[PDB]
Write a protein that binds this ligand. Structure first.
Ligand SMILES: [Ca+2]
Ligand SMILES: [Ca+2]
Length: 316
């Protein structure tokens, strides 16, 4: 009892490459793909319903922002489907189930290409990785550096953010914002969150996407203790670790049109702000989702200083 036929798969070439620039450096916050390509022969003895496995490196994941991990089919050059796959998160393994393609054709070889992202649960901070991808029996490895973003800093105003989750059925996006990650003395701290853009220097711009921010937007604020270090990945997997101070700060969800503001007053600590807001779906399946943050503080010369950040998701 075992429909697995990896023993009948002959892998003739495998490769690990990158989606943006073959750096040896993965730009995880620019959504740089880690690409696994594998060429192989399928024995004639393989039949419809047999399965083969392919293993991701544990530090990668088929999607960095949604929970849909459905793998691309294995096809021939004309797009005829050779095998359909199901992904198992815990083992980071695809099980491909062969279609009747392998009953209809013989002496078949194929290629598959898998796009993956760094798994931020497994890669909290910048680090070196020896990635290993496996089409059992065969393994291929590559050493890389994972790099994350840095905050925009203008005097005591310092801030960064990512879209950490996207739900395309509920049409909600999650923004994880690091406020004052540098743990500076930020006087009269305000953080504004708005649909569209916020330039690095704080300037608002319409931008190339939009969200809905109103009285029903969810906004949570968490204080970071001085002994705590935030993951450079900008994604938090357990918020109970942090002090919920949502009722301690002043939050105006109607600060403007699709625009909210959080008044922190004087702080000496980092904070995490997690925002869940709705977006307007695109008629086909097109996404134009964009939301920006501005941090305002009072600098030592008693003028406002501004720092800005914008996250964007665009489709096809
Ligand atoms: Ca790269
Ligand atoms: Ca066959």
């Amino acid at each position: 009892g075992s429909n697995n036929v990896n023993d009948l798969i002959t892998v003739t070439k495998q490769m690990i490459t990158e989606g943006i620039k073959d750096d040896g450096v993965i730009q995880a916050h620019d959504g740089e793909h880690i690409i696994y390509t594998s060429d192989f022969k399928i024995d004639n003895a393989v039949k419809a319903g047999d399965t083969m496995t392919v293993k991701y490196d544990k530090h990668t994941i088929p999607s960095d922002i949604t929970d849909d991990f459905t793998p691309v089919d294995i096809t021939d050059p004309s797009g005829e489907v050779i095998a359909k796959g199901t992904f198992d998160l815990n083992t980071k393994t695809i099980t491909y189930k062969f279609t009747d393609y392998v009953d209809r054709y013989e002496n078949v070889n194929a290629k598959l290409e898998l796009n993956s992202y760094i798994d931020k649960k497994e890669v909290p901070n910048e680090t070196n990785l020896n990635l290993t991808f496996a089409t059992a029996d065969k393994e291929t490895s590559k050493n890389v550096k994972v790099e994350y973003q840095k905050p925009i800093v203008k005097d005591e105003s310092n801030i960064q953010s990512i879209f950490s989750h996207l739900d395309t059925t509920k049409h909600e996006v999650e923004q994880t914002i690091y406020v004052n990650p540098l743990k500076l003395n930020a006087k009269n701290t305000n953080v504004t969150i708005k649909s569209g853009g916020v330039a690095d220097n704080g300037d608002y711009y319409t931008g190339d996407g939009s969200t809905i921010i109103d009285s029903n937007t969810e906004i949570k604020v968490y204080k970071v203790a001085s002994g705590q270090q935030l993951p450079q990945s900008n994604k938090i997997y357990d918020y109970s670790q942090y002090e919920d101070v949502t009722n301690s700060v002043t939050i105006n969800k109607n600060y403007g049109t699709n625009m909210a503001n959080i008044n922190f007053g004087d702080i000496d600590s980092a904070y995490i702000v997690k925002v869940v807001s709705k977006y307007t779906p695109g008629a086909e399946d097109d996404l134009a989702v964009q939301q920006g943050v501005r941090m305002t503080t009072t600098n030592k010369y008693n003028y406002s200083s501004y720092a800005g950040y914008t996250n964007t998701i665009l489709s096809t």
